[PDB]
Structure formats: structure tokens, C-alpha cells
Ligand binder design. Sequence first.
Ligand SMILES: [K+]
Ligand SMILES: [K+]
Ligand SMILES: [K+]
Ligand SMILES: [K+]
Ligand SMILES: [K+]
Ligand SMILES: [K+]
Ligand SMILES: [Mg+2]
Ligand SMILES: [Mg+2]
Ligand SMILES: [Mg+2]
Ligand SMILES: [Mg+2]
Ligand SMILES: [Mg+2]
Ligand SMILES: [Mg+2]
Ligand SMILES: [Mg+2]
Ligand SMILES: [Mg+2]
Ligand SMILES: [Mg+2]
Ligand SMILES: [Mg+2]
Ligand SMILES: [Mg+2]
Ligand SMILES: [Mg+2]
Ligand SMILES: [Mg+2]
Ligand SMILES: [Mg+2]
Ligand SMILES: [Mg+2]
Ligand SMILES: [Mg+2]
Ligand SMILES: [Mg+2]
Ligand SMILES: [Mg+2]
Ligand SMILES: [Mg+2]
Ligand SMILES: [Mg+2]
Ligand SMILES: [Mg+2]
Ligand SMILES: [Mg+2]
Ligand SMILES: [Mg+2]
Ligand SMILES: [Mg+2]
Ligand SMILES: [Mg+2]
Ligand SMILES: [Mg+2]
Ligand SMILES: [Mg+2]
Ligand SMILES: [Mg+2]
Ligand SMILES: [Mg+2]
Ligand SMILES: [Mg+2]
Ligand SMILES: [Mg+2]
Ligand SMILES: [Mg+2]
Ligand SMILES: [Mg+2]
Ligand SMILES: [Mg+2]
Ligand SMILES: [Mg+2]
Ligand SMILES: [Mg+2]
Ligand SMILES: [Mg+2]
Ligand SMILES: [Mg+2]
Ligand SMILES: [Mg+2]
Ligand SMILES: [Mg+2]
Ligand SMILES: [Mg+2]
Ligand SMILES: [Mg+2]
Ligand SMILES: [Mg+2]
Ligand SMILES: [Mg+2]
Ligand SMILES: [Mg+2]
Ligand SMILES: [Mg+2]
Ligand SMILES: [Mg+2]
Ligand SMILES: [Mg+2]
Ligand SMILES: [Mg+2]
Ligand SMILES: [Mg+2]
Ligand SMILES: [Mg+2]
Ligand SMILES: [Mg+2]
Ligand SMILES: [Mg+2]
Ligand SMILES: [Mg+2]
Ligand SMILES: [Mg+2]
Ligand SMILES: [Mg+2]
Ligand SMILES: [Mg+2]
Ligand SMILES: [Mg+2]
Ligand SMILES: [Mg+2]
Ligand SMILES: [Mg+2]
Ligand SMILES: [Mg+2]
Ligand code: NA
Ligand code: NA
Lengths: 211, 203, 258
Amino acid sequence: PTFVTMQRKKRVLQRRLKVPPALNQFTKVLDRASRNEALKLIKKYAPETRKARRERLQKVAEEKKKDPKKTVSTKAPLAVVTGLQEVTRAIEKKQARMVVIANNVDPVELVLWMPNLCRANKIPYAIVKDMARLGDAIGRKTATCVALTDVNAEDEATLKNLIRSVNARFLSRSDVIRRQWGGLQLSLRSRAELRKKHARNAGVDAAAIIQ
Amino acid sequence: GAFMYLNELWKKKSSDVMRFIQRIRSWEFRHQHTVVRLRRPTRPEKARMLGYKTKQGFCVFRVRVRRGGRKRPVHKGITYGKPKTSGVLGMKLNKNNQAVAEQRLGKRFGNLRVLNSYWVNMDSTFKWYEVIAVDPMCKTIRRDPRINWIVNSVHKHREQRGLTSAGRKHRGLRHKGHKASKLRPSYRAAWRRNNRIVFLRKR
Amino acid sequence: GKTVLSCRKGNGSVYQVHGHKRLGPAKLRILDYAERHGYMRGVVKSIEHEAGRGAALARVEFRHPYKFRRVKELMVAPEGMFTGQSVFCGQKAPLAIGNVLPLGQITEGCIVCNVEAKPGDRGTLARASGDYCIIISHNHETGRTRLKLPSGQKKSVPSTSRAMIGIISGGGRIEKPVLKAGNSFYRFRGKRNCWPKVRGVARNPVEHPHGGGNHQHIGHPSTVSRHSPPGQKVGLIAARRTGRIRGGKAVKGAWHPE
RNA sequence: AAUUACCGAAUCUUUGAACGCAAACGGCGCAUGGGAGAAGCUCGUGUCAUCCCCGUGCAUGCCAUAUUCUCAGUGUCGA
RNA sequence: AAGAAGACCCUGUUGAGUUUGACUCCAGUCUGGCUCUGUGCGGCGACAUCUGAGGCUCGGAACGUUGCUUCACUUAUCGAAUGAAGAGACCAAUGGGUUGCGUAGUCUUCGGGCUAUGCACCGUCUAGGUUUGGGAGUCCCCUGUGGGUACCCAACCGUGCUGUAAACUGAACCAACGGGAUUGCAGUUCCGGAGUCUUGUUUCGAGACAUCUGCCAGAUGGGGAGUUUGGCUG
RNA sequence: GAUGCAUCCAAGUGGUGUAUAUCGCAAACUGAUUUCUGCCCAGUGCUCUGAAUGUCAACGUGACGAGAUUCACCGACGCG
RNA sequence: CACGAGUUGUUCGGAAACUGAGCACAACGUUAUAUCGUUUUGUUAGGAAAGUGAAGGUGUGUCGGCGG
RNA sequence: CCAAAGAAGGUGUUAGCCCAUUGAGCCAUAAACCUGAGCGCCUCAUGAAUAAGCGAGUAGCACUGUUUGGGAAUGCAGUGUCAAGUUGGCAGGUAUUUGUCUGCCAAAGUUAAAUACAGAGUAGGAAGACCGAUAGCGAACAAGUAGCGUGAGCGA
RNA sequence: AGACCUGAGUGUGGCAGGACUACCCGCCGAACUUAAGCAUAUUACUCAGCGGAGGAAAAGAAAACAACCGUGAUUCUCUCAGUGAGCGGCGAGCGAAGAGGGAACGAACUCGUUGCCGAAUCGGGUCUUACAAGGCCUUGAGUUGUGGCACAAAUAUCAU
Ligand SMILES: [K+]
Ligand SMILES: [K+]
Ligand SMILES: [K+]
Ligand SMILES: [K+]
Ligand SMILES: [K+]
Ligand SMILES: [K+]
Ligand SMILES: [Mg+2]
Ligand SMILES: [Mg+2]
Ligand SMILES: [Mg+2]
Ligand SMILES: [Mg+2]
Ligand SMILES: [Mg+2]
Ligand SMILES: [Mg+2]
Ligand SMILES: [Mg+2]
Ligand SMILES: [Mg+2]
Ligand SMILES: [Mg+2]
Ligand SMILES: [Mg+2]
Ligand SMILES: [Mg+2]
Ligand SMILES: [Mg+2]
Ligand SMILES: [Mg+2]
Ligand SMILES: [Mg+2]
Ligand SMILES: [Mg+2]
Ligand SMILES: [Mg+2]
Ligand SMILES: [Mg+2]
Ligand SMILES: [Mg+2]
Ligand SMILES: [Mg+2]
Ligand SMILES: [Mg+2]
Ligand SMILES: [Mg+2]
Ligand SMILES: [Mg+2]
Ligand SMILES: [Mg+2]
Ligand SMILES: [Mg+2]
Ligand SMILES: [Mg+2]
Ligand SMILES: [Mg+2]
Ligand SMILES: [Mg+2]
Ligand SMILES: [Mg+2]
Ligand SMILES: [Mg+2]
Ligand SMILES: [Mg+2]
Ligand SMILES: [Mg+2]
Ligand SMILES: [Mg+2]
Ligand SMILES: [Mg+2]
Ligand SMILES: [Mg+2]
Ligand SMILES: [Mg+2]
Ligand SMILES: [Mg+2]
Ligand SMILES: [Mg+2]
Ligand SMILES: [Mg+2]
Ligand SMILES: [Mg+2]
Ligand SMILES: [Mg+2]
Ligand SMILES: [Mg+2]
Ligand SMILES: [Mg+2]
Ligand SMILES: [Mg+2]
Ligand SMILES: [Mg+2]
Ligand SMILES: [Mg+2]
Ligand SMILES: [Mg+2]
Ligand SMILES: [Mg+2]
Ligand SMILES: [Mg+2]
Ligand SMILES: [Mg+2]
Ligand SMILES: [Mg+2]
Ligand SMILES: [Mg+2]
Ligand SMILES: [Mg+2]
Ligand SMILES: [Mg+2]
Ligand SMILES: [Mg+2]
Ligand SMILES: [Mg+2]
Ligand SMILES: [Mg+2]
Ligand SMILES: [Mg+2]
Ligand SMILES: [Mg+2]
Ligand SMILES: [Mg+2]
Ligand SMILES: [Mg+2]
Ligand SMILES: [Mg+2]
Ligand code: NA
Ligand code: NA
């Protein structure tokens, strides 16, 4: 079917051409081990579902219905920041300890600028393999980005170790990331054709050497 | 907010990264149909400015139009009458291509109402416009005060009457005052004002 | 004026091929895997005449390489092909008349017909009756074979293109004088509506550039430019020379630097 | 139950955008409801094969939707 | 005499058919530029910075950028074919892989990278041909007949290869069989018989040109359109 | 010699000769056979070479000027 | 002209139910505009247009053979 | 004799009083419409007592074409090229480069009335210094009828 | 295994197609004719053609006029004005705008953006006499952003 051919051909054209660094940086993702650790932490601080939020809100009114003179907070428990608008505000306000960004957002212009914004505010960040896996951690279908603003005491060590790991791959490698182009990758048949051609003409010009 | 970064990124259309993104998309759109339904807009920041919302009853379609000047459809390129009307290849359509794209979409799908449209990509032979359409029978549309107006029958096929933003553009309606006196409220209306012979009862 | 007849025929209409009673396009078998790596054996079932074509046609029965059924392809018969003959098509086919071989497997000087201009086009060159190509040489560096076309032109094609060994049957057809308008009538009955031919000077000036005059004459040179628009491009189109050819008929067509 | 006038309740053949498929054919279907059935089986009553009659659904496109229906992809992942 | 507001001739600032070296133009054709339009290796210039060494001319790099151009390439594109029916590799890089480890430099946010350069992985199986090691089984019925044994491994080539090398008309499908689980035999199974893999393209040819697409520009252009083709005058 | 020639068409992945492939297709002239078909390329057509071979656009390149403007160079068929 | 009548089919002709020169619905493309183009050289459409079903497994109905 | 009625139709000749008309007023009502945003009930809503930005293949500009009274270009279209936002941008009707002033803030959307009905319809009404059966609509009448043409149409 | 991205099949609930077309909106678009000829011009941004609505349509809340002592969305009327504007083989011809007197007018609002919030949002079931602008439930949609508050007619809003 036409859509099957086009999605396969689209992948080919994204490796044959010369990919500018602003796009090639999204193919250089965090390693599998730290990606699993990051998603595990995000899952632990997942936002409360519709059911949980409703029960908490109803209980608050019970306190207020008891004594209307006093005041009871309606704030949600500590959780990761989700949504492009809210994650962006957390970065600009410099509240996020670490940002997790997905690498397959289409259109990519939604998050193409985010690694530069995180670098400009010296906020640790990482680029991970799937926006669907990011959604599973927060209990949604997909998620463009997730920001952590704070964690509990027992998880501070994990967050600090996580920050060090993502800093090695992304924040400390800013000079490499800003300059590394991608693409220009030959096909297997083209590579094999080039390999066999060199092997055919390996020692043809030997007699032209004085030595 | 995040809009500002999205908006300023789309102002660097000639940069290395944006040309690469558009080159891939233009190649993909070349191998698609003239009219294609999308789940989400390719430019959510641009679509929202033009009235799109992520609600039930909002639909986005990508429409393709062929580029170039209009060729007069005369047999064998033979015209008659005065030589002033002898041109075949050099005349231009008095309607812009964005308005043509909206009219093709609205004429094909009569159950929808065309709201607005925007430029997404170009190519040597094709121009792509994404058109925002609204379903008038949807309950979400019918109960939303911000979009309720489009249900009324006076807005049926408003793109065929040049009432959209692109239609207003080629009507000269972006201008007021001394730059638009002869075309307001329309060219025909001003012509009627200036050319009807008036017979007062006592003259 | 009015539309010239030569331009009117581009609409088709009553000037199209008389395709009824034709057996279909004549082609070699598809350049499949068996052809590319081994050979396929077929049996000539019949030799038939098709209306409008001088050369005889052959129905060759092959087995389906993948399914349990027969194929029964139809190709232009070379001279000497007979019913019950075994036909070999493929890489390993022996050099014999009626066999189809890759051009790179055919020796210098072998006479071939039904030559593929492009690999896999199922035969496009040397197909008219009595016609054939002559293989000049092969070049193993670039994988191209050079052949002499029936018009005398020299052309190079990929060595993977297939050719049939022999000459096309039905030669000598043009050497018999027709002798009768009725015989010309039956000849074009199977081809198309193009006969009889009325001279342009015999038409009226509204219809043809050559029409009109108190004498039947072309009042202007009959050699016309290559850039003249349709309706003006009648006569001798872009002629390099005119008059009787003396001392050798040069090869006609356009010069190719190859 | 006069006859007029007006209008809330009804009827409304074959068609036609005409839309199950066609058409100088009052033609021919696939589903699902019925009806009549002097053959056959059953005790003139029941039931009823083939045949016949009637109702409803059945064009294409688009939108929304699925107690969250069934799928496809050398798309991206994850086991 | 009738039949028709002379058909000949002239006039009108009335036409129309046709022609062309009329006037003014339009399609078509061709041509240039831009664009479509990508990668890498060179060559020849221009500019910039600095220098010649003779008598404004001429010659140098070395860092950059760029106007043309050679060659190699492939993903845009174009041309064919096919029921998109068997591509390439395994034969191994100037290859990919932090969903590997070293060495030497050079950076670091101290977490780890970047440049070269090794090693190891991805990663591998074969018809046939030639010649190196190894082990291992003619018998029944009557001179005849029937059944059966003359193998595996390794290296080299080869490259996916069970049939034809003068042709006269055949049949072939919906698997046997062997393993692994659940003496032999039979169920439900996978496995191979029918090799595996995919930085991916249906295949072939061409290929960043081509008129391939649009735009701008110029020639040509009764093929076609519109119009004109004075006046005086025995 | 098919990415062809002729050519339809307002336009496309459009159309015809072409279900074809030089013993073919398309365009002209003459007009069976027989015997022949002389001279002329100055003219007008058609057709084929110069790498500076003059001129002819747009685009490009540089320069004076505050800039519009202007100037110089480059520039293909075609004509010569 | 007026009034009143007449046309009877399992097998006759047509249709149900064939293909031909051909047409052009869908699909796709084009056009400011579909009222345009393609649509038989085995044959639509960048094209996922088959709702039909060998054999099995699993129940029912008409048989068969075996032993109890 | 009536007239708050003289009003024009009908009736066998010219009618205020022969008939019907011509007025207060009476009766009946789906919803909608109007009325301390009419007035109750339940339900649901609801009023009063510190910095940042503001619409991009868009506006411009070039070429071509068209349109305009718009004239070194009034709008628009195609292609090429394509911004600003650090007193920014647009307009200020002779092109350019400067620096002062004035007004306004494009490139997203809705909106009643006053206006049209130059060969339309529905339900009603009021008329005319108009025509008066070769007139006035083609049609005062079984008129878009009869009839004609293959047809588009023509048409008493 | 599964996910979500893209794309299909079917069921369920709907909508489009045609008619009308006087007026109105968008495109396309002549020629007769006038110039005592004719090509620019004129007829005319008209007829014919193709689309699309409504009781009207379109326009409409200043990137507007002006240059004043200033006016203040749109539309229409008289006038400006057949113009000491302008366009034009500067020929034939063509040709508006601001201001002023009036009609109308309760005339103004919404989104995007920016800040502060953030699923408070939408559908679908179900209940209340109720396909409630209501309660409850709902992964179904939606965080690739639905809604809320404040942006010069403004100067807090949010609980009581
Ligand atoms: K003929
Ligand atoms: K004839
Ligand atoms: K002549
Ligand atoms: K002849
Ligand atoms: K058609
Ligand atoms: K005009
Ligand atoms: Mg959130
Ligand atoms: Mg004309
Ligand atoms: Mg006005
Ligand atoms: Mg006026
Ligand atoms: Mg007037
Ligand atoms: Mg014709
Ligand atoms: Mg003749
Ligand atoms: Mg004659
Ligand atoms: Mg002629
Ligand atoms: Mg003659
Ligand atoms: Mg002659
Ligand atoms: Mg029907
Ligand atoms: Mg139908
Ligand atoms: Mg998969
Ligand atoms: Mg006379
Ligand atoms: Mg006369
Ligand atoms: Mg006259
Ligand atoms: Mg005179
Ligand atoms: Mg005539
Ligand atoms: Mg001409
Ligand atoms: Mg002429
Ligand atoms: Mg005279
Ligand atoms: Mg052809
Ligand atoms: Mg001749
Ligand atoms: Mg002779
Ligand atoms: Mg001569
Ligand atoms: Mg000559
Ligand atoms: Mg210049
Ligand atoms: Mg009679
Ligand atoms: Mg009778
Ligand atoms: Mg065809
Ligand atoms: Mg047929
Ligand atoms: Mg068919
Ligand atoms: Mg096809
Ligand atoms: Mg009276
Ligand atoms: Mg009364
Ligand atoms: Mg009240
Ligand atoms: Mg703005
Ligand atoms: Mg622009
Ligand atoms: Mg004009
Ligand atoms: Mg202009
Ligand atoms: Mg212009
Ligand atoms: Mg409006
Ligand atoms: Mg009166
Ligand atoms: Mg009369
Ligand atoms: Mg009359
Ligand atoms: Mg009459
Ligand atoms: Mg007139
Ligand atoms: Mg005149
Ligand atoms: Mg005159
Ligand atoms: Mg005249
Ligand atoms: Mg009209
Ligand atoms: Mg009104
Ligand atoms: Mg309106
Ligand atoms: Mg005003
Ligand atoms: Mg005056
Ligand atoms: Mg005018
Ligand atoms: Mg006023
Ligand atoms: Mg006024
Ligand atoms: Mg509810
Ligand atoms: Mg919002
Ligand atoms: Na044909
Ligand atoms: Na009432």
C-alpha cells in the first residue's frame, strides 16, 4: 500500500541527505539504562488521574464544610510537570531540575528549540527514545516533554545521579552537539558495491611507484 | 510561552534546518493526494491563530494547487476581437492560490464549513495550504459561543463568495480610506453607486 | 484557413489503427528470474498471420515458472521457425536460430532480431519482415554491446538486453509490384485509414499551403524549417538536401556522436 | 352526513438531486421482516418445498462515534 | 409585358473568402538565466591578507568563499518493465554500532566526550569444479533377473548455480520425508525439506543533467487573429 | 532508432500514427509500361562549421553617487 | 363521422443471461469552473476495491465396518 | 326619513333609505411575540459592598499582466526575492536619500438598523390624469395551449 | 506480549448533492457600437459563461480622515461634482475622495498572543418531571492544550 512504501522511503531519505545539527541532535539519545531510570522516576511522580483528583477535591470540601472560617489548601501532591506550555514555563522560570524530551515529535518544531532553551538556562536535560514511552510513565498516550521540579527526600539521590548521567551525554557535550551534522549514510548495497570496487582495483597502480 | 519559540522558528524559513524539514515534507506531499485529511495541523501555532481549536468538530485538510500563471482556455490559443484581448499565456488569475485551495476543499466536502487556511509548504510545481474546516452538526460546535456563528446558513460556502481571509485579500479588503474607496463594500456595489442614474421626484 | 489533414490525424477519430482481427502485441517473454540465471524451454505451437503485419507470428507454449499452468506467449517469428520446434530463452540458452539470448552471450557478427533497446522491454528493434541487426562488438568494461540497425545506424545498448537469433520471417515482400489500386486497398484495410493520397497542390488554398493557383504548383520552396508550427510544416521537413542522390545513399536520421 | 371558508390530524401511484444494480426493460438483486400457498408430510385442521406478492435496509463522499469493535505497516519503540 | 431593391460597372471613409515582402500582434518551436538540486574528490580562476622582481606586468602559498569545470556517487528527478516474482550481502570496508574494550593526543559541566589509531562484535550458509586428512558396509531368486552399497571433513576456485549446447510438439499443482518436543506406530505441535541477513530503496537504465517543473528573457513565427490597402479624374 | 519524427490538446501520470519498430511510421512531388530525365547554388528557401566570430535580451559582476538613477563588463539561439 | 368491440404464450420475439465496434459510473488527475480527460494492446485506480472459499478441527443428520 | 354611516359593489333604466357594505363592541385562542428585563415554585448560575507581549513566505521589493480618476505605478494576481519589532511598523495622492511632525497599529473572527429587490417567490392589502380585445403581458378564452421543428427552440 | 504513529474495514448517529437565482457575493468575460477611417481608448471592469447565499446580501469597530478651535465602526441620502481634481491617439471620451446637512444607531464583541492557573474542558452513559449551561460516572477525546482570570470603556482576584 502507498502509505507503507512512503513511510519506508521517508526513513531512507532522512539518512541519505545531510542533516543539520539542530535536527541530528535528536538522533543522539540517552542510553537505555539511564532512560529506564528516568522513566521509572517520572512514573513515581506521575500526575494524579481524574479519579484521584476528584476524591482529593471532594475531601477538601469536607474540611471546609466542617469549619468555614478556617482554610484548607487544595494543592495537588508533588508531581512532574507535563504539557508543552507548562514545561516551557518551568524552564524559563528556572524551576525544573531536569527536563526529559522525546525525539519523535512530529512536527519536530514543537520541541526543536527545547534543548537550546535548556542549555541557555543551564538546566539539565535528556532526549529519550519514545514520546509514547514518556506518555506511559505519566499515564497518557504521548508526551512531548516532562519536567521534574522537586522530589521527596528518598528520591533526591536518584535525581542527582540522574542529573549527572544526562549531563554527561547532553549538557557537557554542548560544543559537539552544536556542530555535529548527520546523515550522509550509504545503503548496504551501496556500501558493498564500494567495498568490492576498491578490492578490485587494490593494486592496479602499483607499478607507478618508484619504490 | 512556547508559542513564541514556535512562532520565531517559523520566521527562519530559509535556514539550514528549516529547509531540510520542508524538503522532506515537500517530497512526502508530492506523493500524496490533492486533498489529504490530517489528524493534527502541521503548524499548530499557526492554525490556532486562525481559529482552529483541539476540540470535537474541527478538521484540518492539506490541499495541493499547481503553481504558475493562468493560461486562457481558448482553442489552439486563438482569440478574436481587438488585439488588446489577444493574450493567452500572460494573463493572471484575479484570485490568489490560497483562495483557490479553500474553494476546492469546500466544494468537495459540502458537509463542512471552511473557516481559514494557511501556507505550509511550496515546491517548484506545487503549493500546499492547510484548510481548517468545522462540522456544523457537531454538538461541541453547536454549543460553543466562540464558533457558534458558523452554524447559521448565511455562512454556507463562504469561501465560494470570497468571505474568508484569502478571499478578502484579493478583493482589496485589507485596505481602507483612499486606497479602497472604489472597492468598498465591493467593486460592484461602488459601481452601482457611481453609475445608477438618479431621478429625484422634483428635479 | 482550415485545419490541414496531417494535423487532423492527431485527433485520432477515423484515422486510428484497425485493431480488430489482430492477435495482440508481439513480445518476448518477460525477463524473469529463470531468464536471468538459467533458461526456459518452450514449444512452438503455431505459425499465424496477423492482419496488417508482413512478418509471421509464433505462439510458443511455456510452463509457468511458479504456478501449475501454461503461458502461451506470442512473438514475431524468425525465418525458419516451425511448429514443434523447441525454443530456449535465458542466460544458458544455446546459440541457435529462434533462441533468445542476452546480447553479451552472442558472438561478434551474429545476426539477431527482436532486439531489446532497453533490458526487459520485450523486443523493440528489428521486428519488420526481413529485418535484422548485426552485432559489431561488446565492451566488457562498461557492459555495452554495439549493433548495426536495419537502417545502417550504429547503436550501443546494455549487454543485458535480449535478442533473438535469426532474421525476421516474411522477407522480400516489397519486391513484388502491387499493380493495382485494389491491391493497395486491401493492404491498408488491416492497417489504418491513410489511403488513397491526395496531393497538396490538388487541394484548395484554404486547406493546404500548396493549394491554389491557376496552375498546379508550389509557389514557394517545399523545404520547410524544423521550427515551423503545425499546419505550416508540410513538404520536405528540415531537409538537409534535395534532388537525386548520386554516389551513395547516406545513412538517414539524426547524427549521434556515439 | 348539506354546502362553502379556513386549518392544526391524515392519505399521498410511477419517477425525478434519485441514492441497491439497470433501463426505448413498468426489468434484476443481496439482507431482514411478513403474506398467500389445491404438492408433499400431519390430524377438512395444521405445517409447508419450488414458485409468487408486500414492507424496511442496502449509492458515493465527508464528519462524529465504537459499554471502547476488527485489523495493516522491513513507521517509531518495547518485550 | 411578368418574374428579382443589376449578379456587370462605379460610389460608400460597408463587408467577407484567400494571399503575402502590408501594419499590429498571438499560439507553436527554439534559445539563455534562475529553480527544481543532493554527496564526495580534484582542476582552472576571482576576491581578501600578505608577498614577487624587473621595467602598471608577471609569480608564490594558507588559512576561507565561490564563479565555472573533470571524475566518482545516489536520495531528488526522468525513461522503461513487471500480476511491482526472487535485489544486494554473506566472498567483509575508505562500513555501522556509546539500545564494546584498549593506545596516544586534546577537551571537560568531572558525569564523560572529540580526534586519529588498533582489537573485538554486527557477521553466515552454499550447487558444482580441483585436490588435502579421516572411517566403513555386495546380497537373494535362478548364464539371467530383482534389490542394494561405493561416504564424511578440510583448503582453493566458483557465486546462489539439480535441466539444454541442432531443433522436428509428454507429464509436472493442492509434498513426501526427516527431526525436536509432547522397538516402533499414531495424534497436537513447531523445526527443515524450501540457507540466513537488511544503515530500509519493486527491478533495470539514466542521473543532479534534462526542458524535468514553474518563472523571467530573446529570436523565429500567414500556423493563426485584427485592421488597412488616399484623393482628383469628360 | 522511441527521453524519436509528425502531431491533438485549456490542463494532467492526458491523446493519435503506435496492438507499431526502417521490408516501419510520418511528410511532399510526379503519375502505368518503354526510352530518357541535360546545364545553373548568383537570388529566395532549407540545411551544416568558426570558440572571439561582429551584433542581439534578461539574469549576473564591478564601480561613481546620499540614493533613485547611471556607467562598464559578461551574455544564447538568430542575423551577418 | 358516431357508437360498440377486438390483441389470450412454460416452448414465438425481447428481458432474465453472451460478447463486438464502442460508451463512460467509480477511482484518480485537471480545470477559477467538471458540464474536462483517462477508462480492452488483459482491462480501473499510488492501487489495501476478493466477504468466495480446498482442506482440516468442531457439532448435527443419512449410511458403513468391528467387538461387546 | 337616516347620516359618527353620501362608500365607489349588486339588483331588469341614473339608488344614502331594495341587498351587501361602511362603527362601537362581543366571542374563541398550540407555540412564539409584548407586559415592574409580566408573575409564583424547584433547580442552577451570578453582581455589588508586575512585569511581559499583541497575528511571517505576511507586509514590502523586482519583473510581468490586469484593473483604477490614482498620474516615477489605485487595488489585485503569478513567479523571484523576502523583513522590522533597541522611540518598531503603516498612512500622510511627484520618484530618491536624510530628519522633524501628525494619525493609526495590518497580515484571526462575529455583529442589528438605516440600503437593493433592474424579467424571483409566500400570505395579504392600497391604488392609477395608464391600455381598452390588431390595444394592454404571447396569453381577458381548456395559453406557454393548438400547431411547427431531429433538436436547441419557435409559438398563435 | 503490548504500546502509539500512520492508514484501513464495518456497525451507530448525522450532513452534502437538486430546485430558485429579481436583488446580492466570487470568478470569467465579448463584440456590435463611438471615435464620422482604425489599432490604444470606448461600449465595459457590461452581455453571455461558471460557482454561492439570504430575507436581504455584502461591509463593519481604524495599521481611518485630516493638517482643523480638529473629526471618530459600517451602510445609505442630498451635496461635494460632469469637477480651474485628475485619467485620455490629452482625441472621442472618462472621472472619484475628505469635509457639511441628514437616515440609522441602547453598538459593540470573540479568539490567538503575553502574564497567572491548569483538564477546572468536551463528548458519552445515568439520575433529578430535564438528550439541564445541574449532580454522579466515564480513558473515550484532549497536555502536539480544552477551559478560567486580567489586558486603556482597565487598574487587582479568591475565598467567607
Ligand atoms: K480512405
Ligand atoms: K476513402
Ligand atoms: K499553389
Ligand atoms: K505515388
Ligand atoms: K468523462
Ligand atoms: K472598464
Ligand atoms: Mg499538565
Ligand atoms: Mg476578444
Ligand atoms: Mg462613501
Ligand atoms: Mg452620489
Ligand atoms: Mg454616473
Ligand atoms: Mg476536433
Ligand atoms: Mg495522390
Ligand atoms: Mg480544384
Ligand atoms: Mg494557406
Ligand atoms: Mg501538373
Ligand atoms: Mg506541378
Ligand atoms: Mg436507480
Ligand atoms: Mg445512479
Ligand atoms: Mg510492527
Ligand atoms: Mg439596386
Ligand atoms: Mg442587389
Ligand atoms: Mg458606407
Ligand atoms: Mg468620402
Ligand atoms: Mg465569403
Ligand atoms: Mg504569420
Ligand atoms: Mg490575416
Ligand atoms: Mg477616386
Ligand atoms: Mg507516440
Ligand atoms: Mg519534386
Ligand atoms: Mg516517362
Ligand atoms: Mg541558386
Ligand atoms: Mg542557395
Ligand atoms: Mg543590473
Ligand atoms: Mg375515426
Ligand atoms: Mg371507440
Ligand atoms: Mg487507450
Ligand atoms: Mg469493447
Ligand atoms: Mg471495467
Ligand atoms: Mg493502470
Ligand atoms: Mg348603486
Ligand atoms: Mg367595521
Ligand atoms: Mg421581572
Ligand atoms: Mg497586530
Ligand atoms: Mg510574500
Ligand atoms: Mg480600463
Ligand atoms: Mg498598475
Ligand atoms: Mg503592476
Ligand atoms: Mg463579516
Ligand atoms: Mg391616491
Ligand atoms: Mg379581433
Ligand atoms: Mg392580444
Ligand atoms: Mg397576440
Ligand atoms: Mg448598442
Ligand atoms: Mg468607427
Ligand atoms: Mg460611420
Ligand atoms: Mg468598421
Ligand atoms: Mg450575467
Ligand atoms: Mg433591512
Ligand atoms: Mg451578513
Ligand atoms: Mg466614519
Ligand atoms: Mg457647480
Ligand atoms: Mg470606465
Ligand atoms: Mg456627516
Ligand atoms: Mg455624509
Ligand atoms: Mg449529564
Ligand atoms: Mg486558550
Ligand atoms: Na486502438
Ligand atoms: Na396568551
